Design a protein around this ligand. Structure first.
Ligand SMILES: O=C(O)CC[C@H](CC(=O)O)C(=O)O
Ligand SMILES: [Cl-]
Ligand SMILES: [Cl-]
Ligand code: NI
Length: 498
């Protein structure tokens, strides 16, 4: 059976609603649904579904000449009226998409002719095309697939215009995709991809060793990192470690004792041995992170001061702040309350857990008591919505979300970043400046707003940056080189020659 391939993913791909989030998996959404405009490594975009466009001088009104020759999939036509209906379906759920500033900006969309689409924006919005390129939400499902006249409540069947079709899905066993034969673009060489649902990292490694899995592709969690390092030595396998794509950190709750105290957040930044953490937990496969964004991220080379590992500084900071060691205890007290801090994390991820124990042990040495609460993933998202954490693992999103989309999302009253930042006197200022970062057309202005925002987040110790992580590949040598997509969350199955 060339030309079919088998892979793994630790969960099912999900309902494949193009317009919702969890549990839809983004690489899958991107396999089935396509955008107006496709993101490129240079940061630019190229015509995709939209063959061309023009804009008013004031730059608020955009007219896209769609391609004429595109059909979902189930045969139905792709035309301006379908696009308009998707946008409308998206904007009915607007408050959910408020993390993405484009959502806050679309004033209306109007189908001109069969081939002309009119989007109008509240401002001349410079991140427009790149944000339209995103896996989600501005991608197109056959309107004939709504429920009522909505997508926010569910869809019927995942019909899009992409090169791949969801054939079959069996919770929690496997998802099958077949190549779309009536596809407007280039023919993918692979005709079928099967995702075996396999939640555990070691089992994923054993499954690759059996010969049944053609390709594994994913982040640091893909498989255990010591086995990956063995696999890389094996002349009968192929492996790849990309350059770093995003950052992994703790977020510290500034609106919740004791992490509401600057001194405490700084003493925590000082108390962790990051290199020891990375060589141990992460097997020296990844690199040490000092700042929310690596210096290689646009706008982010700022020379921000690293917090290097320093338990005496940490415990001096704590001391000066009134957190003191009472006769007979390990753990500091202020007005009789112990320096206790809750760290929350997906109870079943092996990496988070290992990291958590290390962090726990490192703080304990400075008189801070962290208790590990491992819990259900849905419970973790909830506390992130809620504001119900001391410290929480968290990560950035990869190009092209970093920094601009990731900063935008910090403003939206729920998720992790707004909640962790709620207790800063500085917060309304930072939210106004993020806003200005997305508004301004002058690069010199942009350079300084980014410096001011990232500098404040950094000096206020909102985060404990941990590492900069990479994509990871394990594959059969016959597939050749496996490429990386310009969007970090996509997998470019269509480029593989088996
Ligand atoms: O890129 C990411 O990890 C997240 C970006 C956005 C965030 C959300 O769930 O509100 C999404 O998930 O598309
Ligand atoms: Cl509205
Ligand atoms: Cl998030
Ligand atoms: Ni997300």
């Amino acid at each position: 059976a060339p030309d079919e391939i088998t892979t793994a993913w630790p969960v099912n791909v999900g309902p494949l609603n193009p317009h919702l989030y969890t549990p839809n998996q983004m690489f899958a959404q991107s396999m089935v649904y396509e955008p107006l405009v496709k993101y490129q490594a240079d940061g630019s975009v190229i015509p995709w579904l939209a063959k061309s466009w023009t804009h008013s001088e004031d730059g608020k009104t955009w007219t896209f000449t769609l391609r004429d020759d595109v059909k979902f999939s189930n045969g139905e036509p792709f035309d301006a009226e379908a696009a308009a209906e998707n946008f409308r379906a998206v904007l009915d759920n607007r408050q959910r998409h408020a993390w993405l500033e484009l959502a806050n900006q679309i004033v209306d969309v109007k189908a001109l002719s069969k081939t002309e689409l009119q989007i109008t924006l509240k401002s001349a919005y410079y991140p427009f095309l790149q944000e339209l390129a995103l896996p989600r939400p501005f991608r197109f499902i056959a309107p004939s697939q709504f429920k009522n006249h909505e997508t926010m409540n569910g869809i019927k069947a995942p019909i899009g215009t992409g090169p791949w079709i969801l054939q079959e899905s069996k919770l929690n066993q496997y998802d099958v995709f077949v190549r779309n034969e009536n596809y407007w673009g280039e023919k993918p060489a692979i005709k079928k991809i099967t995702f075996n649902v396999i939640p555990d990292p070691t089992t994923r490694a054993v499954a690759f060793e059996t010969g049944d899995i053609d390709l594994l592709y994913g982040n640091e969690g893909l498989l255990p990192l010591d086995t990956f390092a063995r696999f890389s030595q094996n002349p009968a396998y192929h492996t790849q470690l990309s350059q770093p794509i995003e950052t992994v950190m703790l977020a510290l709750n500034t609106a919740k004792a004791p992490t509401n105290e600057l001194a405490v957040r700084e003493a925590l930044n000082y108390a962790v041995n990051k290199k020891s953490l990375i060589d141990n937990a992460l097997y020296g496969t990844q690199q040490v992170a000092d700042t929310l964004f690596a210096p290689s991220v646009p706008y982010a080379n700022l020379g921000l001061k690293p917090s290097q590992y320093d338990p005496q500084k940490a415990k001096a900071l704590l001391e000066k702040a009134g957190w003191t060691l009472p006769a007979g205890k390990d753990i500091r007290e202020k007005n009789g309350q112990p320096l206790r801090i809750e760290l929350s994390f997906i109870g079943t991820d092996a990496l988070s857990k290992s990291m958590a124990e290390i962090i726990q042990a490192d703080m304990r040495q400075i008189g801070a008591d962290v208790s590990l609460i491992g819990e259900e993933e849905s419970s973790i998202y909830a506390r992130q919505r809620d504001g119900r954490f001391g410290m929480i693992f968290h990560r950035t999103w990869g190009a092209p979300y970093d920094p601009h989309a990731f900063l935008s999302s910090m403003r939206v009253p729920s998720h992790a970043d707004f909640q962790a930042q709620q207790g800063l006197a500085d917060k309304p200022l930072i939210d106004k400046e993020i806003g200005e970062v997305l508004a301004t057309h002058d690069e010199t202005q942009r350079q300084a707003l980014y410096r001011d925002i990232l500098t404040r987040l950094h000096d206020e110790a909102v985060y404990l940056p941990i590492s900069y992580i990479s994509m990871m590949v394990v594959s059969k040598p016959e597939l050749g080189n496996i490429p990386y997509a310009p969007i970090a969350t996509e997998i470019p199955f269509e480029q593989i020659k088996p």
